[PDB]
Design a protein around this nucleic acid. Structure first.
Lengths: 338, 350
DNA sequence: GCATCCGTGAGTCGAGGAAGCACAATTTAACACTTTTGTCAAG
DNA sequence: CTTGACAAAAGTGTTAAATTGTGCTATACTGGGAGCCGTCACGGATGC
């Protein structure tokens, strides 16, 4: 279906026939032989094994794929300049790289069957399939046909692992580490088992006891507080959808008009009070309290500006602070701002 | 947005644009002398997935023979459509016939039709009709205890294929080193092996069979067809708005009112881009802007709970899919997987 | 011309707020110590 | 304005927990699941 992404994907993966026992073994053997051939090529030419595999993969995948192409063509020519005995490993590498593509493409139904069992846990059906496909790609890399086990027995481990790790890493807006995700899942299981056995919702004490050593009611509660998903700001309230959560949440970052005015009123009053001080006493207090440059200066730094020793600055500031205290008492025009 | 601006400039229908944009059909950007069903392939032509596969990789089919039976054809013999390969199976295309998995290998010792049985975990290491000196390997296996070798000199004959592969290709025998490798693409006259003694006589994909020491050229073309917005952006970058306007103006003199009505609609969009100074390819996004965080806040409510906007969830989906596509491209994943990831990335942006 | 399809539009305030483990790698916490800073009394 | 004790007040440097990221399981497993459903206007576009 053009409209349905899932139906379109299923149709595409249904165009590749399933592999028989003989077909699967040859593909796995070719992949295994190619990797061994690539390793030998690196030894013979001294090139990085990763670079050799990337050059081989680029040649197989063709020009329909976007190291620039010229460097690939240069390494390709160098490999092709090897003698026949060494060109044989290059041919094996190309055949193995092609086999890797066909072995992967033939097991795309396996991921879909496994992935359909993980829906409803935070990731969509197509997202589960793509994560599973990544485990399937990893399985082809590590699968060993010498053991005579079928591919699905070993691949099902990687497909499930990739899907589960994807859920632990992408299912929540605020990501919780995988280990903490495991703790949350285990706690939910324990509560569910206790709930079905006590005929009621267990308390944190029961859950902590069932979890095991190192768990108490406080830890059970903190873990449950950790696992709370954020609520949407656009959730409707009421039968008619014209009100939302965001309409009821005040902004408490920006200062209010009343807060801004009292800050500016205080600055004006403090400026007038600092007028009664001497020319240098006002500078000392304004420098030490961060009223000039925005940041507090120290006695030594203040002395550096004025060339006086640290001790003297402390005394002169204290006298000025005493002066201001006397002025405030005789006026009481600055106590309301505190 | 009906009528689409992208479709109007490129002259693509609403359905045609959707098929390309969401990876349902290919659009030809360079035919490369490709012929489809006896007709040359032309630029801007829409190809279905089967047509693209036939053009880009060729025609081939595998027919599974029933167990025990022996095919009526030899390995490497050309067949014609309708010919019976095995006693009960008839091919549907002409090409080289190849044994897939020979179940029994019948060697002929000279002094003697000794036979050996082939198992799925075993592979034959010699071609049909080969003289084997006493000692040479014949059938390989995982365990050397079951490995098959030749006691004396003889001729190796392969029988009882698991299936028959019919491939439309040209087979080029060789003796010395081949100058090409598997997956390479060649054109007529290109050297294949033996210093020009063997050369390609047809387009196709070259694959070297070391067991049969021949070079097969699977007849196919190096056509340039693409899907998605990468193809559309390629067409939108190639547009010459000056040239398009002149052609549209000439068609504005057509007697038919529908033709002039359509030409006016196209030229109104063309005129808009010409006058404003915008580029048509800017309608395809390469970088997606991200809204400032304070306009999509994640705030802590008076109770300590967190509230967030829907845009964060939509951004996370696009970022997750974008990152996954990069990983898949780095892994060299098959085209089917990549197409699904690209189709999901487009939907996430939408 | 012609149906058939899709897309856009349809009053205002108010009140209702499901693996598990192993191990490596990174980060956080707790010491330790030295190095400012702030006072002090003098002087 | 100094001038020397002083004491926290702070910072720098290791170290060890505590937290977090990552790889790995080998019987065989191979194409999803939920709508379902009482309105009426218009353009405007295409199927031709």
């Amino acid at each position: 279906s053009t409209s349905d992404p899932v139906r379109q994907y299923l149709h595409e993966i249904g165009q590749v026939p399933l592999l028989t026992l003989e077909e699967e073994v040859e593909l796995a053997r070719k992949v295994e032989e190619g990797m061994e051939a690539i390793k030998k090529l690196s030894e013979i030419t001294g090139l990085d094994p990763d670079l050799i595999r990337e050059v081989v993969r680029a040649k197989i995948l063709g020009s329909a794929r976007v190291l620039d192409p010229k460097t690939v063509e240069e390494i390709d020519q160098k490999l092709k300049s090897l003698p026949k005995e060494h060109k044989r490993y290059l041919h094996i590498a190309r055949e193995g790289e092609a086999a890797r593509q066909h072995l992967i493409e033939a097991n795309l139904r396996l991921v879909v069957s496994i992935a359909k069992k993980y829906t409803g846990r935070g990731l969509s059906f197509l997202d589960l399939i793509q994560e599973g496909n990544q485990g399937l790609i990893r399985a082809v890399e590590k699968f060993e046909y010498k053991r005579r086990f079928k591919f699905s027995t070993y691949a099902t481990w990687w497909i499930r692992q990739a899907i589960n790790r994807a859920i632990a890493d992408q299912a929540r807006t605020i990501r919780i580490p995988v280990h903490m995700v495991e703790t949350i899942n285990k706690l939910s299981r324990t509560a569910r088992q206790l709930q079905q056995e006590l005929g009621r919702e267990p308390t944190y004490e029961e859950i902590a006891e069932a979890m095991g050593p190192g768990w108490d009611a406080k830890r059970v509660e903190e873990t449950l507080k950790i696992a709370q998903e954020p609520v949407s700001l656009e959730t409707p309230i009421g039968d008619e959808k014209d009100s939302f959560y965001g309409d009821f949440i005040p902004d408490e970052h920006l200062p209010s008009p009343v807060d801004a005015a009292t800050q500016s009123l205080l600055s004006e009053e403090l400026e007038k009070a600092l007028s009664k001080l001497s020319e240098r006493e006002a500078m000392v207090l304004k420098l030490r309290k961060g009223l000039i440059d925005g940041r507090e200066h120290t006695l030594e730094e203040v002395g550096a500006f004025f060339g006086v020793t640290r001790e003297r600055i402390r005394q002169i500031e204290n006298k000025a602070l005493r002066k201001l205290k006397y002025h405030e008492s005789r006026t009481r025009k600055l106590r309301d701002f505190l | 947005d009906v009528p689409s601006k992208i479709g109007t400039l490129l002259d693509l229908s609403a359905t045609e644009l959707e098929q390309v944009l969401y990876f349902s059909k290919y659009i030809v950007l360079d035919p490369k002398g490709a012929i489809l069903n006896g007709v040359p392939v032309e630029k801007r032509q829409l190809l279905t997935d089967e047509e693209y596969r036939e053009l880009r990789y060729g025609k081939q089919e595998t027919y599974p023979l029933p167990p025990g039976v022996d095919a009526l054809v030899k390995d490497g013999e050309e067949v014609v459509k309708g010919q019976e390969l095995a006693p009960g199976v008839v091919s549907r295309l002409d090409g080289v016939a190849l044994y897939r998995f020979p179940r029994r290998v019948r060697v002929e010792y000279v002094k003697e039709p000794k036979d050996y049985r082939v198992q799925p975990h075993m592979n034959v290491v010699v071609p049909e009709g080969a003289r084997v000196e006493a000692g040479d390997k014949i059938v390989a296996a995982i365990d050397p205890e079951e490995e098959v070798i030749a006691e004396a000199e003889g001729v190796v004959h392969l029988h009882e294929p698991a299936s028959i592969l019919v491939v439309k290709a040209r087979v080029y025998p060789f003796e010395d080193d081949v100058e090409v490798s598997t997956g390479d693409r060649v054109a007529p006259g290109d050297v294949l092996a033996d210093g020009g003694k063997v050369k390609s006589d047809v387009y196709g994909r070259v694959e070297v069979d070391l067991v049969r020491n021949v070079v097969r050229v699977v007849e196919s073309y190096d056509i340039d067809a693409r899907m998605g917005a990468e193809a559309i952006q390629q067409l939108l970058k190639e547009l010459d708005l000056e040239a398009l306007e002149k052609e549209l103006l000439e068609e504005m003199k057509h007697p038919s009112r529908a033709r002039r009505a359509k030409a006016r609609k196209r030229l109104e969009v063309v005129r808009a881009f010409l006058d404003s100074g915008n580029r048509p390819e800017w309608m395809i996004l390469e970088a997606v802007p991200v809204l400032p965080p304070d306009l999509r806040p994640m705030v802590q409510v008076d109770g300590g709970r967190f509230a967030t906007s829907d845009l964060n969830d939509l951004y996370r989906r696009l970022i997750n899919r974008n990152n996954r596509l990069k990983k898949l491209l780095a892994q060299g994943a098959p085209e089917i997987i990549i197409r699904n990831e690209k189709r999901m990335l487009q939907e996430a942006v939408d």
